[PDB]
Motif scaffolding. Structure first.
Motif, PDB file in Angstrom:
ATOM      1  N   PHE A  96      -9.029  14.855  -0.361  1.00  0.00           N
ATOM      2  CA  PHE A  96      -8.077  13.999  -1.027  1.00  0.00           C
ATOM      3  C   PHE A  96      -6.926  13.931  -0.019  1.00  0.00           C
ATOM      4  N   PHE A  97      -6.113  12.879  -0.078  1.00  0.00           N
ATOM      5  CA  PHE A  97      -5.035  12.707   0.891  1.00  0.00           C
ATOM      6  C   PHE A  97      -3.766  12.058   0.359  1.00  0.00           C
ATOM      7  N   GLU A  98      -2.707  12.156   1.157  1.00  0.00           N
ATOM      8  CA  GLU A  98      -1.418  11.590   0.800  1.00  0.00           C
ATOM      9  C   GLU A  98      -0.815  10.875   1.994  1.00  0.00           C
ATOM     10  N   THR A  99      -0.116   9.777   1.730  1.00  0.00           N
ATOM     11  CA  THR A  99       0.498   9.034   2.804  1.00  0.00           C
ATOM     12  C   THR A  99       2.012   9.131   2.732  1.00  0.00           C
ATOM     13  N   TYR A 100       2.651   9.050   3.889  1.00  0.00           N
ATOM     14  CA  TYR A 100       4.095   9.127   3.944  1.00  0.00           C
ATOM     15  C   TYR A 100       4.574   8.026   4.839  1.00  0.00           C
ATOM     16  N   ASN A 101       5.371   7.151   4.251  1.00  0.00           N
ATOM     17  CA  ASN A 101       5.938   6.036   4.965  1.00  0.00           C
ATOM     18  C   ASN A 101       7.429   6.271   4.905  1.00  0.00           C
ATOM     19  N   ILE A 102       7.949   6.715   6.042  1.00  0.00           N
ATOM     20  CA  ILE A 102       9.344   7.061   6.174  1.00  0.00           C
ATOM     21  C   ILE A 102      10.188   6.176   7.058  1.00  0.00           C
ATOM     22  N   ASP A 103      11.167   5.558   6.425  1.00  0.00           N
ATOM     23  CA  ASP A 103      12.125   4.741   7.127  1.00  0.00           C
ATOM     24  C   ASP A 103      13.141   5.772   7.666  1.00  0.00           C
ATOM     25  N   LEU A 104      13.124   5.967   8.983  1.00  0.00           N
ATOM     26  CA  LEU A 104      13.996   6.934   9.657  1.00  0.00           C
ATOM     27  C   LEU A 104      15.429   6.453   9.882  1.00  0.00           C
ATOM     28  N   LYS A 105      15.623   5.140   9.863  1.00  0.00           N
ATOM     29  CA  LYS A 105      16.948   4.576  10.039  1.00  0.00           C
ATOM     30  C   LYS A 105      17.815   4.981   8.844  1.00  0.00           C
ATOM     31  N   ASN A 106      17.327   4.673   7.645  1.00  0.00           N
ATOM     32  CA  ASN A 106      18.022   4.962   6.397  1.00  0.00           C
ATOM     33  C   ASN A 106      17.541   6.245   5.706  1.00  0.00           C
ATOM     34  N   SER A 107      16.760   7.046   6.427  1.00  0.00           N
ATOM     35  CA  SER A 107      16.235   8.298   5.888  1.00  0.00           C
ATOM     36  C   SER A 107      15.696   8.109   4.474  1.00  0.00           C
ATOM     37  N   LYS A 108      14.577   7.398   4.337  1.00  0.00           N
ATOM     38  CA  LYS A 108      13.985   7.156   3.013  1.00  0.00           C
ATOM     39  C   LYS A 108      12.458   7.033   2.971  1.00  0.00           C
ATOM     40  N   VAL A 109      11.851   7.686   1.994  1.00  0.00           N
ATOM     41  CA  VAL A 109      10.405   7.627   1.819  1.00  0.00           C
ATOM     42  C   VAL A 109      10.093   6.385   0.967  1.00  0.00           C
ATOM     43  N   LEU A 110       9.254   5.505   1.488  1.00  0.00           N
ATOM     44  CA  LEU A 110       8.932   4.281   0.780  1.00  0.00           C
ATOM     45  C   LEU A 110       7.570   4.248   0.117  1.00  0.00           C
ATOM     46  N   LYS A 111       7.512   3.600  -1.040  1.00  0.00           N
ATOM     47  CA  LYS A 111       6.258   3.417  -1.746  1.00  0.00           C
ATOM     48  C   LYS A 111       5.980   1.927  -1.552  1.00  0.00           C
ATOM     49  N   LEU A 112       4.735   1.501  -1.743  1.00  0.00           N
ATOM     50  CA  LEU A 112       4.401   0.096  -1.520  1.00  0.00           C
ATOM     51  C   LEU A 112       5.269  -0.921  -2.268  1.00  0.00           C
ATOM     52  N   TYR A 113       5.640  -0.629  -3.510  1.00  0.00           N
ATOM     53  CA  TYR A 113       6.468  -1.566  -4.264  1.00  0.00           C
ATOM     54  C   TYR A 113       7.907  -1.686  -3.741  1.00  0.00           C
ATOM     55  N   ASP A 114       8.252  -0.887  -2.737  1.00  0.00           N
ATOM     56  CA  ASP A 114       9.589  -0.938  -2.139  1.00  0.00           C
ATOM     57  C   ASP A 114       9.604  -1.978  -1.013  1.00  0.00           C
ATOM     58  N   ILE A 115       8.421  -2.246  -0.470  1.00  0.00           N
ATOM     59  CA  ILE A 115       8.247  -3.164   0.650  1.00  0.00           C
ATOM     60  C   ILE A 115       7.791  -4.561   0.250  1.00  0.00           C
ATOM     61  N   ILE A 116       6.921  -4.661  -0.740  1.00  0.00           N
ATOM     62  CA  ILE A 116       6.483  -5.982  -1.146  1.00  0.00           C
ATOM     63  C   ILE A 116       6.634  -6.234  -2.628  1.00  0.00           C
ATOM     64  N   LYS A 117       6.763  -7.511  -2.964  1.00  0.00           N
ATOM     65  CA  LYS A 117       6.938  -7.929  -4.341  1.00  0.00           C
ATOM     66  C   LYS A 117       5.609  -7.975  -5.069  1.00  0.00           C
ATOM     67  N   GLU A 118       5.637  -7.576  -6.333  1.00  0.00           N
ATOM     68  CA  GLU A 118       4.461  -7.546  -7.189  1.00  0.00           C
ATOM     69  C   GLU A 118       3.553  -8.766  -7.038  1.00  0.00           C
ATOM     70  N   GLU A 119       4.149  -9.947  -6.894  1.00  0.00           N
ATOM     71  CA  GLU A 119       3.376 -11.171  -6.759  1.00  0.00           C
ATOM     72  C   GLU A 119       2.520 -11.179  -5.499  1.00  0.00           C
ATOM     73  N   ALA A 120       2.585 -10.111  -4.717  1.00  0.00           N
ATOM     74  CA  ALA A 120       1.800 -10.047  -3.492  1.00  0.00           C
ATOM     75  C   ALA A 120       0.434  -9.461  -3.779  1.00  0.00           C
ATOM     76  N   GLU A 121       0.290  -8.876  -4.960  1.00  0.00           N
ATOM     77  CA  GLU A 121      -0.955  -8.237  -5.339  1.00  0.00           C
ATOM     78  C   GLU A 121      -2.194  -9.112  -5.258  1.00  0.00           C
ATOM     79  N   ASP A 122      -2.186 -10.252  -5.946  1.00  0.00           N
ATOM     80  CA  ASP A 122      -3.347 -11.142  -5.919  1.00  0.00           C
ATOM     81  C   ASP A 122      -3.768 -11.471  -4.497  1.00  0.00           C
ATOM     82  N   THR A 123      -2.786 -11.694  -3.639  1.00  0.00           N
ATOM     83  CA  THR A 123      -3.082 -12.011  -2.256  1.00  0.00           C
ATOM     84  C   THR A 123      -3.811 -10.873  -1.560  1.00  0.00           C
TER      85      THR A 123
END
Lengths: 215, 194
Positions: free
Chosen positions: A105-132
């Protein structure tokens, strides 16, 4: 070369009942040190826990004299992107407490180092991007369906993409799945690439933390 | 990867004996939810324990046993019962319980009305009645009548494979010796009112 803010500390152990291998991810030399501490110990906490669980399980199975072979726990780190202003990596928790193969099993870490923040997918794209995104993956599955479970497509439609593990790269977004969800253990762990331009339209947060050079 | 743990402890002297199984969420992105929820359930288990103690403080040693029963743990969702057993030498043990059904994904504690539509009531009651029928000897005769007039949406319940589990306390449907009635209403039969 340039100063590096990420390192991996390796360490193993062994005895007749269990083999432990650990790759500890650690941030260092961050502009925000409180961020670096909470992150480093938080991930370190999870590793020790996973490891002590695979040990207590080797202990009991052995104590109850039912262990046939040595069990093992293998935590490995896989960096997908290492830039100045961003860091994307996976932590794999492998285990073999018996059987023909072990469970990963695994875990991913997407870290914005400029603003020191861990991002989840919904932080980067809008929900309406799902169907695409699902449409993309579905095309991608049918392209070589012979590799997936016939009901794979159905699960991608059922799947909540925004809570899926994922990594980032300058070239694009990488959605990741575990074994058995979309394909047989033999197929491996499915990863679906998504070019940035194909979802650029739904961004809520930067693509410039990725460009190392403005020139 | 675990996101829940049960810390177990106990203390025993001559007036009272205590056992506490404390539930705890851990590693949630939702920081606030994780501690607000753990402090609350703890505070109750604490209140419960002191009461039993204040009372103990004596024809025999009194008790207090808090136990946690997980029905479904799978990250994104968790369902478990917290049983509060006490005793003051009443020849019997008094037990009341509280259920917890959490949407770990959306950090929301769920109530039955927040899940199925009120249209499942009859289907659920039917199912339960069909079940009491097959064990009538464990239940009081007037039980089916109470199932008929009962308000299912105000009942403690848990989730698990198979489906919804409606739960009852002692005496409500059967003599103490039958235990605390449970009914697993299979999913297939109610996912329509979901």
């Amino acid at each position: 070369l340039r100063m590096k803010v990420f390192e991996i500390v390796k360490s193993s152990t062994e005895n007749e009942i269990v083999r432990i291998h650990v790759e500890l991810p650690r941030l260092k030399y961050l502009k925000d040190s409180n961020f670096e501490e909470k992150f480093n110990s938080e991930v370190e906490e999870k590793i020790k826990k996973f490891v002590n669980e695979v040990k207590g399980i080797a202990q009991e199975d052995h104590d109850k004299d039912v262990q046939h072979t040595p069990y093992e726990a293998y935590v490995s780190v896989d960096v997908r992107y290492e830039g100045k202003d961003f860091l994307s990596f996976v932590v794999y928790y492998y285990q073999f407490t018996g059987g023909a193969h072990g469970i990963t099993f695994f875990e991913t870490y997407n870290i914005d180092l400029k603003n020191s923040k861990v991002l989840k997918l919904y932080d980067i794209i809008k929900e309406e991007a799902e169907d695409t995104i699902k449409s993309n993956i579905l095309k991608q599955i049918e392209q070589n369906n012979t590799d997936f479970f016939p009901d794979a497509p159905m699960n991608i439609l059922k799947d909540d993409i925004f809570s899926r593990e994922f990594t980032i790269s300058k070239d694009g977004l990488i959605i990741m799945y575990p074994h058995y969800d979309l394909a047989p253990y033999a197929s491996g762990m499915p990863e679906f690439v998504i070019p940035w331009n194909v979802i650029e339209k739904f961004l809520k947060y930067d693509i410039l933390s990725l460009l190392k050079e403005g020139h």
